[PDB]
Amino acid sequence: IEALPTHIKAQVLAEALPWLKQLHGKVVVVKYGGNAMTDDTLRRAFAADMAFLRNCGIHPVVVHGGGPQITAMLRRLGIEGDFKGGFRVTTPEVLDVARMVLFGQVGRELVNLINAHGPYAVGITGEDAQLFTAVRRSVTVDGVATDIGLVGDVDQVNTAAMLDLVAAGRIPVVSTLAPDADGVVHNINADTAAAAVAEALGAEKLLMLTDIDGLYTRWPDRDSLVSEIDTGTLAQLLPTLESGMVPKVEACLRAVIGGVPSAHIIDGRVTHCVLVELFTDAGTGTKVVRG
Amino acid sequence: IEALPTHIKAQVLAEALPWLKQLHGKVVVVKYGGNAMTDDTLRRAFAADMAFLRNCGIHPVVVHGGGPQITAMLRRLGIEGDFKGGFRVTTPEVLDVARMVLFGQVGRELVNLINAHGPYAVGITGEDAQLFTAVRRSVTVDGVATDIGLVGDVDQVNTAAMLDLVAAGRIPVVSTLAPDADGVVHNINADTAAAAVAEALGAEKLLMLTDIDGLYTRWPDRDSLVSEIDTGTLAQLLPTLESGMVPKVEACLRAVIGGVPSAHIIDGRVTHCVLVELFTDAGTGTKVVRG
Amino acid sequence: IEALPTHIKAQVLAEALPWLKQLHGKVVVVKYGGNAMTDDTLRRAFAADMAFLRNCGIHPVVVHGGGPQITAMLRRLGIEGDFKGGFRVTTPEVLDVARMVLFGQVGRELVNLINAHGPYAVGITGEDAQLFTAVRRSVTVDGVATDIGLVGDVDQVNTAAMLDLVAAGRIPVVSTLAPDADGVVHNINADTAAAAVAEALGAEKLLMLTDIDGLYTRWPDRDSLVSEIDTGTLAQLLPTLESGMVPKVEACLRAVIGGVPSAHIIDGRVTHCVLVELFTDAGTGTKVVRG
Amino acid sequence: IEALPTHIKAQVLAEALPWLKQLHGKVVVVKYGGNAMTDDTLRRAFAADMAFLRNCGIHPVVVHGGGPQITAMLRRLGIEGDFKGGFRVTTPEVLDVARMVLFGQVGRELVNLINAHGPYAVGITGEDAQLFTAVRRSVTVDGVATDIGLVGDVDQVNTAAMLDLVAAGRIPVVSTLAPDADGVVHNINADTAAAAVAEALGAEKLLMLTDIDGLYTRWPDRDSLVSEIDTGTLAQLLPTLESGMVPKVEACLRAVIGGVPSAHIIDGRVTHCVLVELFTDAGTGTKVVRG
Amino acid sequence: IEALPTHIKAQVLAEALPWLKQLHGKVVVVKYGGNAMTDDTLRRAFAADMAFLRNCGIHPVVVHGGGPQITAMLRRLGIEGDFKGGFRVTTPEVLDVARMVLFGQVGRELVNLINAHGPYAVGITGEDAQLFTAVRRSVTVDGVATDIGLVGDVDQVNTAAMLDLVAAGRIPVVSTLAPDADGVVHNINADTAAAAVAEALGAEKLLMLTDIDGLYTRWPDRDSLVSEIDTGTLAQLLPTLESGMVPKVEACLRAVIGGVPSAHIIDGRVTHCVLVELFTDAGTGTKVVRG
Amino acid sequence: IEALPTHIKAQVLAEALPWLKQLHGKVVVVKYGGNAMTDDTLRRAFAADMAFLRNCGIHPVVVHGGGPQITAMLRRLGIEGDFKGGFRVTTPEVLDVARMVLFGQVGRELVNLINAHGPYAVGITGEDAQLFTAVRRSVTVDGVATDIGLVGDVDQVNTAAMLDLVAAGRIPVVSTLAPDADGVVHNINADTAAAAVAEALGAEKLLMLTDIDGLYTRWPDRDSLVSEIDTGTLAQLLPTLESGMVPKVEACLRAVIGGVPSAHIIDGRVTHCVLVELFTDAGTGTKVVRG
């Protein structure tokens, strides 16, 4: 980015202006996972983009996952799994490990990366200041709803206390664990938690970092790649999508139907994908709007 | 506490008044460890006492340890230790485990206990919002200062951001990990960190929960138990004390010399020891003042 | 309270916690009269309990009476009384004396007692900053409503200005005099004024200090002493109660029906009765709730 | 004021402008006593002028006396006086009467008069919120300093809490009683208290209402009437002035030497003397400045 | 105003009190034009009266015209006019001159005059901070509505930003130019703009300075001069009034019907007419109220 | 900017981050003149860049000139000039025209351009709220200091009121006219005024838009173009520079010596020069630092 003429650098920056205006002073919830979480270059760029948003007066809120790190630690601890369908059962023991890995390892890495740019990141779970609660969820397997232990969905969100934190200039980094109404902590799917946080905070956008170019309606036909789709059309397409994309699409559906103006499935394998999706018209991601 | 006449219950409460006046609106830093951390009755009472202080308009700040929980997890993970003197060397690997256990397990338990009473507790480390930094420390072994890895002392404290948190009505629960000036996270001894936080926050008291009645000057002579001692006298006595008491005494010395009006070594095996030490004249603990 | 074991002192304090949580940040209106007002030990303890509430972050508001002090001063001044039924007629002259005694003597004593603990108490009447107004009341005598001069009921309350005063950390001590809509100051019964202030301020509790154990439904049968009663049941019982208890019961009825969660008739002859009633389950008083 | 041409009414108002600019947002302490306190027309006009200042964004603070009302009440109560020199001895009994008359009668009348114009006036003594303290004073009689009981001078003033009250839009009406360092309430001379309040509050002016045209240097020579004098000249003249003027002059001296820009001795027998002195160049009063 | 006795000066000031109470803390919009704008004595007095209101805690907002100054500058620039009916057509060129004269000359003179008394005046147009917008208006000529270029009516007003300016202690001086919805700046009649600003700001009064004694219903019969009239009566009279008075009357109608409590047509040829109309009962102006 | 690969657009934006961090929450004063003021494309881009800074949480303050527009209007009005040396004498008449052109024409155009992006721009002069004052300046001609009328330098700046305006989210657009201590308005050179505003506001940068690539030390040698120079070196070079560059260089000297961290002479003929200079390392401008 050095031989590139200076009048072209100017145009690239100037074209950010309409999106800076759209997002100034607004909440943007970003689900962070996949290869954006595992490669040092993609990670460092993600943390820089969070600092970028913050130094534009945008209020990012990061919700992270960590499925494979949990599995890796359970295997290290010799904790034998129980599986119903394709789901590990989250016993009290598995929860303790999940919480310890998500909050004490995965979230720590991102907090420190972001904080290389300033005193921005702060880690939290639903446990802290009772910021949100969980309700136990069942899963459908072989056509029957089934209990797989201490896993849940976001129940209620302390919207005011959460926005107080971003008003202090902080970037919350959320590990998806929260107590139920009896104080018993559950693990929440990070994609669904991200949609719930976006709706509760009145976010202007929900970004979903995934390891794909975007939503293909007829995978693997390359021409089936769509760049914008409405919730009604997308809900009808949901039964036909691969297993990995369903939670990302359900998230976008719940968020946009919940009033979030747009949710985006963007390619987490692209360095600075957040900057590309937010401040550029050239993203490969797909945008979900209501309709 | 039922056959006890009602006019005696009244006198007990009324005698709390001078200490409520002393502490209203003031910061009290509490080092929490030992059996107060491991027994369910002592723990639940500790969490209730933190809620008590908060519902009196006192601002508690909890600094916790977790030495044995770390050791237990290292053994579970099969991480062979290296030892210089009696000190485990904190390699990058051992740090990751220490941080994950302290922040993702030990701190979580206390946060949830306290939060059974309200949205009070919030967990943090020096990493979050760069709340404090560490400087690597050496230890003296066989008369020579020696490096034992990523262990440090508190360097600087973001006093303003920390007090903003208690001003929100929060009870910080601090896990003693913090980055050095290069962003590399160190493990800090919880006793020393507690003294450093007390001094930086202008705390009115530092409480040190330990598993002993109090400071014995000539252990094990029962009559050597003292109830108040000045920093000058206590510094001269420090070379003669058992190994377990030195860090607790050094903490009290640094805090009180640092301007904290008093530091207290109190018996963490007594249910509601905090209430006893703060709102009663009948504590067995020992009080350190400057002189 | 010295030979009493330390673990019992701890339990007494710890059992205050649920009521500290209930009252933190809340308004508590206390009608103060009777022997609690005349004996030096009961008085000093009352003032200490007001300071106690204030140093817990509770907002006490004190409404005081002074019937007998007024009578005593009228006799000293040689002011001959006029009586309709059992009621002294409050001429302009009698009002001046009542106001001067209530505000310039009785209220002064309590303000100074409370202020021995800090800059808390502040005296006021409805006259000051037009904090409340009066409407002239008649009384029923021999079955006919009758004018007995410048006596009234609370008309309107400047809720906002009153709460601004407690927000400053002040403890208002209210002498029950207030202007009517024409600026003419009336004397208001202190029991009824206390209920009116409680309702207007959204108080969490109304305490009525009286010189009896509590409400007896069939005085003097000792077993008729009740510890909790609903407003509907109590309204039906009101025509059967002794003359001294009627104003205290009407007060509790108006307050609780007015939305105050509970009103309490407690024994003002018990040292620290406020502490006993608020922070203990062993009070002899009776609690009024809606039903 | 009806046949007077309209262009003359305009000029009178327009000439108020430089003094409105001088006083906007500033504290003005007014000592109120004499015939301005006893005649219904002068009183009602005084209260209106206090409302005038308040509705210009000026912050009046009223300090009142009441010597003769106290004497009258003592005689009504049959309280025999003890006299040293020309001074009544203020026994505990005489204090109670003084406080009750000053705060519960004299201050009440002014509060109600002012409040006919709005929720402005609020009565206070040094007792309330420990707004100020007293130190016992002796008097010189026949050349020897002598104790005459519970009479004092203002010791310390809670400047911040007092200015908080005027910031709320209130007009404090101060009765000059205050506790000493042991909580024992003393009666303070109202002229001296007014000067002390002016200095502590950083008042822009001190007004002293008296029943004379102004300072005569060689009473009763009519030409000895001066309209402005400096503190140095006036201090030298003080030993030669009549008994009634000394406290008013000592007050002006202490205030202006204390940094109050000017103190004024104005004729309280003139209806609306405050308006005349503050917003007009035609006052008969005398102005004291430093020099 | 020197031989006039001092007790008469006092009465004049004291009679201002009810209107100071009415206006304290309230917005007063003043249309300023005519001879009040062109004579140095009337101008300087107008600026002083704006400073007077400000130093009483009243919030004046000045809307100014400048018709003849515009004409004079157009003639100096040799800009030939086009006229439909009696209306100059406001071409883009004529607008530039109008804006430059109104904002860069006429408004500057008033700002500087007012600012001789303090940092009060601040000049603005609808362009600044998009404080208000315009909508293009047509005029009726020979019975047909006709376009006369870039002239409009106030469309929307940024009420909040405007009141923020007066809350800072500023006196806005408004030049009536504002952009339409496409950013194209229009010239707005100053009388109509003044009524629109008064209604949008919730003004307590609208003052209309004109070069006449007041509204004559049957000009030139001297007895037809009315001092107060309701909007319904005045609307019926509007078709019968001289050409110069129609815009002033339409303004008062729109304002008072828009909820402004009263609008006043006052004689701008009287020195200090504002002071006379606001703080005196002797104004020759006419008051419009709803009915 | 369309065929350019998306990973290059990302890198351009990401490289803005260190300068966004440097400028977030900081004041940047921009002198705007030259061709950046006269060409529609350069102007519209300048206004967009001001909106860009504002939507990043940067606080721009624009100081504008307008020399040639003034000359053009004087010629249109037939105002014959008087010239001493090469300086037009600013008579009272010439000032009125200068003020009317600068504030009522030139500043209006920029305000409206900026406001196409939001309610940002607000026009002001030193006259408004007495935001700054002028002191009359002389010029040196043929070796003698000479009066050329109502031209001056910035004297004092109301730093607090000016920063209150940018705190409201406003972008001040300053026309360089201000009253002297006697209220007489002077015209101030816009380059010098810009440096004075930067120093008084504690600006982080001063940008000087000019119609040259940057400072040439040995014009017209192309290799004499420097990209960074210290104040000491640059002061020594000042006597050797062309006439047009002297005011721009004196400005940078006064600002940087006045404590402004850096002042920049940048090429106003480059579209989006502000974006290029601030958020890019590829600017042709020259940076002045202290040394």
Numbering used by the authors:
A (entry chain A), B (entry chain A), C (entry chain A), D (entry chain A), E (entry chain A), F (entry chain A): 4 to 294
What sentences appear in the manuscript?
(A) Overlap of X-ray crystal structures of protomers of Apo-ArgB, ArgB co-crystallized with N-acetyl glutamate (NAG), and ArgB co-crystallized with L-arginine. In the conditions used in the assay, ArgB with 5% DMSO displayed a melting temperature of 48 °C. The addition of 1 mM ATP, N-acetyl-glutamate and L-arginine showed positive melting shifts of 2.0, 11.8 and 8.6 °C respectively.
The L-arginine biosynthesis pathway consists of eight enzymes that catalyse the conversion of L-glutamate to L-arginine, appears to be attractive target for anti-Tuberculosis (TB) drug discovery. The arginine biosynthesis pathway consists of eight different enzymes ([Fig fig1]) all considered to be essential for *M. tuberculosis* growth *in vitro*. In this work, the ligandability of four enzymes of the pathway ArgB, ArgC, ArgD and ArgF is explored using a fragment-based approach. In conclusion, using a fragment-based approach, we have discovered inhibitors that bind to novel sites in ArgB and ArgF and to the active sites of ArgC and ArgD, which in case of ArgB show on target activity against *M. tuberculosis*.
